[PDB]
Structure 1
Amino acid sequence: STELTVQSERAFQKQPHIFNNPKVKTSKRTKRWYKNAGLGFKTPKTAIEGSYIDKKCPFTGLVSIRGKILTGTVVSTKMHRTIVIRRAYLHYIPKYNRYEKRHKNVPVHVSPAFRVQVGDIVTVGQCRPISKTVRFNVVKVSAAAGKANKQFAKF
């Protein structure tokens, strides 16, 4: 994500305490801070080489992934840098020795290192409270094919 207007806000978007010295020209252009989130979650090369800021990103931001590592189907990418995932499960009623389908809607912050859409299976990880309802970041996206390569028209 090296484009689409990083400085789109009234404040200068920068990573805090990362200093680009203008007197000595750095050998690498526009020094970027990144980290591995841990738990075998690979920092994407878009996070490493991008130009976005996202202070709530799990790789280039100031949040840490710790706690639950959940997985869910994306049902809504209609916010800016926040998605809603569906965590469908099954609840056991012990009287009838049977289960019932249930679901929970979890709002998750998404970094612009990840391009997600409705239908993707994402792996999310618990962070500190990001907003009123968001306590998770997307740390992994698990839809590469998605059966979306053969639907297009032919001759």
Structure 2
Amino acid sequence: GVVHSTKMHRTIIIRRNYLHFIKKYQRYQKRHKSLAVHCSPAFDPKQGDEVVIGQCRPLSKTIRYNVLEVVS
């Protein structure tokens, strides 16, 4: 995903953009999902950066993933 917001503490919101196919019209829609991801202090991602996230145990009400790698 791509980093969307870094306003929380040690947590970032990433956005996964994808195309959803509507069968009747034989066309696509642009859709997105937002995920709350724990970001370790080993990384310093900025908005717009692409990150690799791995699934972990529930760390908070919404966090289910951890940042594993940052690509500028």
TM-score bin, normalised by smaller chain: over 0.9
Q: Distance in 2 between matches of 1:81 and 1:129?
A: 15
Structure 2: unaligned runs, 5 residues or longer = none
One-letter code aligned to 1:135: R
Q: Secondary structure at the match of 1:141?
A: strand
Structure number with the bigger relative contact order (C-alpha 8 A, sep ≥ 6) is 2
**How many residue pairs end up in the alignment?**
72
Structure 1 segments, 4+ long, off by >2 Å, are none
Secondary structure, in 3 states, of the residue corresponding to 1:128? coil
- The equivalent residue for 2:59 is 130
TM-score normalised according to structure 2 size: 0.98
Report the Cα offset of residue 95 of structure 1.
Answer: 0.2
State the distance in 2 between where 1:98 and 1:106 align.
26
Q: From 128, 139, 144, give the equivalent of 2:68.
A: 139
Correspondence for 1:121: 50
Task: Give the TM-score normalised by structure 1.
Answer: 0.46
Letter of the aligned partner of 1:127 in structure 2? C
Q: 2:37 aligns with which of 90, 108, 124?
A: 108
Q: Given residue 5 of structure 2, which amino acid in structure 1 is its aligned partner?
A: S
CA distance in 2, matches of 1:95, 1:138: 38
- Equivalent-residue separation in structure 1 for 2:36 and 2:56 (angstroms): 12
In structure 2, what is the equivalent of residue 58 of structure 1? none
> Quick check: which one's strand share is greater?
2
Shift of 1:135: 0.2
RMSD of equivalent CA atoms: 0.5
Shift of 1:114: 0.4
| Greater Cα radius of gyration, structure 1 or 2 | 1
Q: Give the gaps of 5 or more residues in structure 1.
A: 1-71, 144-155
